[PDB]
Amino acid sequence: RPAILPSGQILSNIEVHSHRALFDIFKRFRSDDNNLYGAEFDALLGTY
Amino acid sequence: RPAILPSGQILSNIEVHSHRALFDIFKRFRSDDNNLYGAEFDALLGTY
Amino acid sequence: RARLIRQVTLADFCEPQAERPGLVVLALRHPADLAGAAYAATPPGKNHRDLEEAWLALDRASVVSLNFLVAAAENADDALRAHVTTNYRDRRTAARLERFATVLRAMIRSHVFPHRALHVLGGLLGHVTQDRLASVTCVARGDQEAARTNDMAARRSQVHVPACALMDVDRELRLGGDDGLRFAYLVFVYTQRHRREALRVHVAVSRLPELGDALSFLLAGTRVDNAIHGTDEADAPAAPAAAAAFPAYLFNDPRSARCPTGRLNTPAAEALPVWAPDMRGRATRNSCMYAAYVRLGTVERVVRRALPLAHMERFTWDVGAWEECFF
Amino acid sequence: EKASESYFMGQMQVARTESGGGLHLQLTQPRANVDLGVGFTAAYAAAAL
Amino acid sequence: MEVDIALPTLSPGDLSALQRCEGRVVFLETLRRHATLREVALPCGGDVLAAMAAYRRRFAAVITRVTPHRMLATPLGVGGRGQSLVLQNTGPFDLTNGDHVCLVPPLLGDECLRLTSANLELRFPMTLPLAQARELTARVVARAAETLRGGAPARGADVVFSNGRRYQLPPPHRDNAEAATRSLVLNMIFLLNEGAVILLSLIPNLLTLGAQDGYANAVIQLGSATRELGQLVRQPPPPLPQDHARRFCVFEALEAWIASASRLGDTLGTRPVARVCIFDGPPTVPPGEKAAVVEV
Amino acid sequence: MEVDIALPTLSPGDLSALQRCEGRVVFLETLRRHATLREVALPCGGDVLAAMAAYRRRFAAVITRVTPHRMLATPLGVGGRGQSLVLQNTGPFDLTNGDHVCLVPPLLGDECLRLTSANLELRFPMTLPLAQARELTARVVARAAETLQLPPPHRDNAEAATRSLVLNMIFLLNEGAVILLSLIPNLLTLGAQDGYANAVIQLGSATRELGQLVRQPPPPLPQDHARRFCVFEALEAWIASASRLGDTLGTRPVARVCIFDGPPTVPPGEKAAVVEV
Amino acid sequence: CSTLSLVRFLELGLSVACVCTKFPELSYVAEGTIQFEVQQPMIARDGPHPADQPVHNYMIKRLDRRSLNAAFSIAVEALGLISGENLDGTHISSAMRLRAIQQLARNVQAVLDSFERGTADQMLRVLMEKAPPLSLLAPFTLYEGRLA
Amino acid sequence: KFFTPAEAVAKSRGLARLIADTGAAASPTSNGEYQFKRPVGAGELVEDP
């Protein structure tokens, strides 16, 4: 679930896999994951 | 019964509890003691 | 706000012009019922009218300042004796202190303990005095400095305790704890050896809600030497008879002599074993009494600063009931 | 470096609890922080001893 | 939290008597802003033990001003800041300034309002200082016990002092003192004997030690650390197969004794309910006269 | 005074579970105004006797609000007796209006809001009415005395409970107490002409098993049977002891239940108003 | 007398380390996060080595939350002399009302100031936790991309 | 810290984790007149290689 319009451009051209545990959650792939290309949401359809 | 107006300002910014040797009496209350308010006085009432 | 007590009385033991406000005061029982209850309370062997005499030797007067009582005990630092003697206005005062000492030492000897003779009031703040007649006023609940003294130099007050008697506990027992809100206990220490006995006073603060084992270990020597020399002067009989051994082997015996109810006067039931529980001169509970305490309230801080003293910090008066410490 | 920490501040929050005649105020302010750099963005050196 | 009590109109004359009890205490049932007089009522000839046990499952409340329509009470348990309130002392002897009061049923000869117009009775419990009450209970129980074994029925020393004056401790037959107290003395003496028996059964050789050097040493060792003279409690003999008509498991008996002793100790009051803080008055309030009090 | 308990960062899997603990009680050790959550915490269940002995050495505190940063509390009894608060019940028996409540360590364990992120677990004590807490303490201490839904003892602290019990029992034996001990048959015979007299005596009475097996002679007159009287002293001592025997093994009742409008009996798992004592 | 020397955070040099910002609803905020986007380059090899496709990855970082505190106790006599509850009609009451109010001001000026030195300290406390020692770090960035 | 292997159960999914942790470790000892087990609750920043 990526954002659409970002806020700031990260500029450091650094390797990122080697710094795995520097943060909580991250997933990587190569291309065409077919999961990114699927919208899903949870609606509530009425209040009474 | 502290002083009412200070003559001149001090300049050093130093902790003082560790230099209590230099002084003769030294009293440090925590914050706004309720004792420095009450002010009594002696009086002489008429001379004949 | 806090609520107060006013009790008009005699300027005998607490002398509210001699001390400044902020020190605990005690209420003294009427001595008539003490002298009476002695007649039935002093143990066997001892004297049974010596408290009568000790009281008669000191002749209503109702209050007694702790500052005065602490002086008339074993433990005291002579500076406070000198202060009480030379700083009290009153006539004949040192003699009275001596007589009061003899009174309390008689009280413990007669097994009517002073903790059953001194209820505790709050810290005094005000007084108006005639010639040898005062009307002290002390707090009873709430925090001390909710009051309003008519000094006009220091409207509010604090609580002052003679630092000679203030025994801290936690830093003493080394609980490794960190000082937060701590309780406050006034404790008595008895010691019982006939014609050689005394009383020790203390004011104890700690976080411990239940003293119990804490004093039982703190006063170990007192309990030890009090349990053994306490039964003295009581004629114990000779070696206990073997019949005193309460038989236990006979409870779940299927075959044994038995006797239904309704035939117990003098029937042919003499075949039952005899057992004579014989307890005459052993250590009773009042024999092993060594300390007594009572909760006073809650405290923030204790600082020592001047005669040595000990200023309390945000004392909240909450008086509790008395407590025995014998086991 | 130029921007190593995103750092947020709340609003000062007081608790004027009366306690024993005199008020005893208690100030408090919550604040949160987070790093925003991929790869390390700090390093000490331990010069003297 | 002040409750009012509907009052079924009685008569003249009797309502004056109801007005005279403007200071005593009454035991409500639940904290509701309304209640009927028929609810707060007890047969004024009753068992002292059961009444003292019931005093716990209720709330104390003092009768403030009364009117032919209703009467107002104020509970003591719940409360805000422990406000002051007036109280009519009704014990047998006075109470001084700066002590704690306790609520015990009318142990001695009873007094009870008999509202003959409404056909109901009221009991107003005594108001005693703490230690004097804890000793008066023992006094009455010990007198009944001495009577029980048919020994010397009198010793001339069943008297209690309080602030000089000697009190007589009225003779124990006036209203029903030979019947409304039997329960208490039985339930106390029995438990005492049972505790003694259990202890002696767990330590059979306690009363065969040194008259002055063995027993004291055992007690001082027990109070001190873990020596305990081995299993000072010798292993009791093994029980029966629990259908034999003479089974006796000592430990279950100890369990029952602990439970019953705790329960009896809790249903005795002796936990202060108030404290006299009289101010601007005679420092010693005699019986029958009101006295300023702050709830604890 | 309002104890403030600070919280570390928490996963949403357990913050929402902690939100549900809005009316339970925890045990601090010192009454500073601030205190971290890690401090107020007890290890997982074990030795209900030891735990019950530990509740005496610390004063309780009930919590009221749980914010994403901060979690308040209230020191139960240090200077107050009428601070009407609310705490939820977690004991099996439903506590009714009128009676007091006492804190008791939990049985069987299984009551541990095990927080993985913070790597700690809490064990909130259950709340029982007085009448049943006394009986539970009785059962556990008796079982400890046996070893010279139920966990076994540890033989290192059970001796301390036995010591307290045997002391409180030993000091009942007085030269006056034997006088009372003399009328066991005179008591049994009295427990026959009437019904209530027989009713007060139990069934496995542990004394009827004695009065029908052993005869005892008239008691020896104590020293000075004219000046003083001993039965009175022994009975006064026994009252003084029994008034404080229940608490010395368990815990004093900490609060009594008062409810102004709701239904009288409150079931398990439901909050109910209270006033402390 | 002594005069207290105030200090303002943004005037220090340390401010170049953090992007401060107001957020007056931080007390209502549960776990908050921030996301990073990044895609790596790639070179097209030849021969026995197999070609590689680009790599993308997403990631999130969670906030850390703290708080500060400072007491400001004031007395009861000054409290009653400020309001007028314990005032008097004299020429000696106001002479002390002035004293009480100026002392209260001198007190709040010190307490309210402490939240600047406070953030100055918290910045160091949080920076010093992230920083790995340089010795353990200089050779690590020379084997990167090879720790396979 | 030589014989306790439980840190393995705290499995390592990055060397940068180990690097960034040494420099952020909590002090296990106290500041008394001897070396005692420190109460873990407070927490103190210390480094060890």
Side-chain angles (χ1 to χ4, degrees), chain C residues 204-285:
Chain C
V205 298
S206 85
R207 80 177 60 95
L208 277 277
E210 259 2 287
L211 274 303
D213 43 32
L215 258 107
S216 80
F217 163 84
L218 275 249
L219 297 195
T222 348
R223 155 175 54 99
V224 171
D225 73 336
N226 200 294
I228 78 165
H229 299 298
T231 101
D232 79 332
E233 277 133 350
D235 201 329
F246 158 70
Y249 59 74
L250 208 81
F251 275 54
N252 293 349
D253 217 31
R255 177 158 168 199
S256 180
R258 266 292 272 281
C259 213
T261 17
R263 59 195 306 212
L264 266 244
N265 325 22
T266 100
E270 260 47 21
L272 298 184
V274 203
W275 160 53
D278 240 325
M279 255 178 74
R280 280 198 307 122
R282 294 186 174 79
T284 183
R285 173 177 63 166

Side-chain angles (χ1 to χ4, degrees), chain C residues 45-261:
Chain C
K46 296 196 188 243
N47 212 356
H48 74 46
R49 284 218 1 175
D50 75 8
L51 180 82
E52 198 70 333
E53 185 253 32
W55 203 243
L56 287 205
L58 191 40
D59 93 336
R60 182 203 39 148
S62 89
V63 282
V64 15
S65 102
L66 177 54
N67 203 51
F68 176 83
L69 167 86
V70 62
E74 183 228 307
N75 98 332
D77 250 88
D78 232 4
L80 174 124
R81 287 207 181 73
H83 161 285
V84 148
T85 13
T86 65
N87 264 34
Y88 283 169
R89 284 298 248 301
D90 243 90
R91 196 48 216 102
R92 80 202 18 119
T93 279
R96 206 177 293 128
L97 193 151
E98 254 149 7
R99 320 216 182 253
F100 201 31
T102 59
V103 177
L104 310 146
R105 296 188 300 263
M107 274 155 153
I108 327 196
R109 189 160 54 217
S110 75
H111 279 79
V112 178
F113 308 89
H115 79 249
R116 199 173 286 116
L118 284 178
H119 299 65
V120 15
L121 312 183
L124 83 171
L125 61 92
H127 68 292
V128 40
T129 351
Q130 232 5 4
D131 270 272
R132 200 175 141 169
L133 180 132
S135 87
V136 323
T137 335
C138 32
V139 295
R141 286 193 73 258
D143 161 320
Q144 176 81 21
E145 313 133 26
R148 193 133 140 93
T149 302
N150 325 323
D151 188 357
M152 242 51 137
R155 310 307 306 273
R156 316 311 210 204
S157 77
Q158 284 193 321
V159 181
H160 305 172
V161 178
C164 149
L166 179 139
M167 156 180 72
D168 186 44
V169 181
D170 44 24
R171 245 271 340 299
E172 178 330 293
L173 269 158
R174 299 184 294 146
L175 299 201
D178 254 18
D179 16 84
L181 182 131
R182 322 209 290 274
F183 284 87
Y185 295 90
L186 173 100
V187 85
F188 287 170
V189 185
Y190 305 146
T191 230
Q192 312 190 20
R193 288 163 151 203
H194 192 255
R195 262 183 238 121
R196 209 198 44 216
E197 72 270 19
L199 172 143
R200 291 176 49 214
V201 112
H202 285 288
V203 156
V205 298
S206 85
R207 80 177 60 95
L208 277 277
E210 259 2 287
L211 274 303
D213 43 32
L215 258 107
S216 80
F217 163 84
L218 275 249
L219 297 195
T222 348
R223 155 175 54 99
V224 171
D225 73 336
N226 200 294
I228 78 165
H229 299 298
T231 101
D232 79 332
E233 277 133 350
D235 201 329
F246 158 70
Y249 59 74
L250 208 81
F251 275 54
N252 293 349
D253 217 31
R255 177 158 168 199
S256 180
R258 266 292 272 281
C259 213
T261 17

Side-chain angles (χ1 to χ4, degrees), chain B residues 6 8-10 31-32 34 36-37, chain G residues 1-2 73 75 78 96 100 103 107:
Chain B
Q9 69 181 331
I10 205 174
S31 158
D32 198 353
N34 50 1
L36 57 89
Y37 290 89
Chain G
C1 76
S2 173
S73 65
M96 281 160 41
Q103 208 266 1
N107 214 324

Side-chain angles (χ1 to χ4, degrees), chain C residues 210, chain E residues 262 266 271, chain F residues 27 48-60 76 100-105 125-126 128-131 133-134 136-138 244-255:
Chain C
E210 259 2 287
Chain E
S262 287
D266 281 349
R271 322 295 278 271
Chain F
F27 282 113
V48 311
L49 187 45
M52 184 191 296
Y55 294 159
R56 276 187 293 256
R57 210 172 294 272
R58 303 155 156 180
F59 55 88
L76 200 35
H100 313 73
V101 62
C102 169
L103 313 165
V104 171
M126 45 203 275
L128 296 187
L130 199 44
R134 300 311 207 198
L136 193 87
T137 44
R244 199 180 32 259
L245 185 53
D247 174 40
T248 301
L249 306 187
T251 294
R252 74 169 54 79
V254 69

Side-chain angles (χ1 to χ4, degrees), chain C residues 38-46 48 116 141 177-181 183 207-210 213 216 233-236 246-247 250-252 256-262 264 269-270 272-281 283-286 288 295 297-298 314 316 318-320 322-324 326-327, chain F residues 1 29-33 39 55-59 77-81 163-164 167-168 170-178 181-182 184-185 188-189 192 206 208-224 227-229 232-234 236-241 244 247-248 252:
Chain C
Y39 274 49
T42 140
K46 296 196 188 243
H48 74 46
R116 199 173 286 116
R141 286 193 73 258
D178 254 18
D179 16 84
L181 182 131
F183 284 87
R207 80 177 60 95
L208 277 277
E210 259 2 287
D213 43 32
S216 80
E233 277 133 350
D235 201 329
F246 158 70
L250 208 81
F251 275 54
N252 293 349
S256 180
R258 266 292 272 281
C259 213
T261 17
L264 266 244
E270 260 47 21
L272 298 184
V274 203
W275 160 53
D278 240 325
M279 255 178 74
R280 280 198 307 122
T284 183
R285 173 177 63 166
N286 287 7
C288 298
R295 199 174 67 176
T298 65
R314 201 174 292 187
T316 315
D318 175 88
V319 156
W322 275 107
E323 238 13 339
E324 304 297 314
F326 53 94
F327 68 95
Chain F
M1 199 160 315
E29 212 175 359
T30 46
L31 192 56
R32 285 189 309 269
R33 286 186 172 266
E39 272 196 10
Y55 294 159
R56 276 187 293 256
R57 210 172 294 272
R58 303 155 156 180
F59 55 88
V78 295
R81 306 194 176 86
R163 186 187 85 81
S164 297
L167 266 184
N168 284 266
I170 279 188
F171 276 120
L172 301 202
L173 268 288
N174 302 57
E175 59 165 277
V178 56
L181 206 47
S182 302
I184 319 176
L188 292 163
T189 302
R208 295 209 296 191
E209 179 269 336
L210 178 78
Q212 68 183 358
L213 265 76
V214 170
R215 175 186 68 91
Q216 53 169 314
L221 60 87
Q223 319 184 196
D224 294 288
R227 160 178 81 260
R228 59 163 194 145
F229 39 94
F232 168 69
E233 294 180 353
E236 191 264 359
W238 185 85
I239 285 181
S241 177
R244 199 180 32 259
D247 174 40
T248 301
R252 74 169 54 79

Side-chain angles (χ1 to χ4, degrees), chain F residues 26-242:
Chain F
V26 303
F27 282 113
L28 318 180
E29 212 175 359
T30 46
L31 192 56
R32 285 189 309 269
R33 286 186 172 266
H34 303 183
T36 185
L37 159 77
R38 184 75 50 113
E39 272 196 10
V40 56
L42 292 202
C44 79
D47 273 358
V48 311
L49 187 45
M52 184 191 296
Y55 294 159
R56 276 187 293 256
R57 210 172 294 272
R58 303 155 156 180
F59 55 88
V62 58
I63 65 179
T64 80
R65 285 194 85 193
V66 177
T67 49
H69 298 148
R70 184 174 298 114
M71 154 177 152
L72 268 59
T74 296
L76 200 35
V78 295
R81 306 194 176 86
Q83 192 39 47
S84 196
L85 57 89
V86 59
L87 78 165
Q88 72 181 357
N89 173 289
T90 177
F93 304 89
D94 42 355
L95 77 173
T96 186
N97 183 6
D99 56 18
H100 313 73
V101 62
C102 169
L103 313 165
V104 171
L107 275 299
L108 188 147
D110 292 15
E111 323 313 326
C112 307
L113 292 204
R114 321 182 198 281
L115 310 183
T116 78
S117 89
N119 260 348
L120 55 93
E121 79 289 344
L122 307 189
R123 199 184 46 162
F124 314 100
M126 45 203 275
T127 78
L128 296 187
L130 199 44
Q132 314 163 355
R134 300 311 207 198
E135 180 68 21
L136 193 87
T137 44
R139 191 58 197 159
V140 176
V141 170
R143 182 160 210 273
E146 298 182 289
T147 196
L148 302 102
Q149 208 179 9
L150 283 77
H154 197 198
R155 207 82 179 273
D156 292 358
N157 43 18
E159 312 271 31
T162 292
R163 186 187 85 81
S164 297
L165 162 68
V166 66
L167 266 184
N168 284 266
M169 288 198 317
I170 279 188
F171 276 120
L172 301 202
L173 268 288
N174 302 57
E175 59 165 277
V178 56
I179 307 282
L180 282 154
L181 206 47
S182 302
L183 57 86
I184 319 176
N186 209 350
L187 201 153
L188 292 163
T189 302
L190 185 155
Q193 318 90 325
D194 205 291
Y196 286 110
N198 186 280
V200 58
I201 289 178
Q202 277 84 339
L203 71 173
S205 43
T207 50
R208 295 209 296 191
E209 179 269 336
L210 178 78
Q212 68 183 358
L213 265 76
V214 170
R215 175 186 68 91
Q216 53 169 314
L221 60 87
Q223 319 184 196
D224 294 288
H225 202 59
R227 160 178 81 260
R228 59 163 194 145
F229 39 94
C230 297
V231 195
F232 168 69
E233 294 180 353
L235 269 177
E236 191 264 359
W238 185 85
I239 285 181
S241 177

Side-chain angles (χ1 to χ4, degrees), chain B residues 5-21:
Chain B
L5 270 80
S7 166
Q9 69 181 331
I10 205 174
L11 283 197
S12 67
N13 167 26
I14 190 74
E15 72 157 38
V16 62
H17 172 81
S18 65
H19 307 265
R20 51 189 154 95

Side-chain angles (χ1 to χ4, degrees), chain G residues 31-49:
Chain G
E31 270 204 358
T33 69
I34 52 181
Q35 296 192 5
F36 292 102
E37 96 282 355
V38 59
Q39 53 183 352
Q40 290 167 51
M42 68 156 170
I43 63 173
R45 322 175 60 77
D46 195 327
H49 310 93

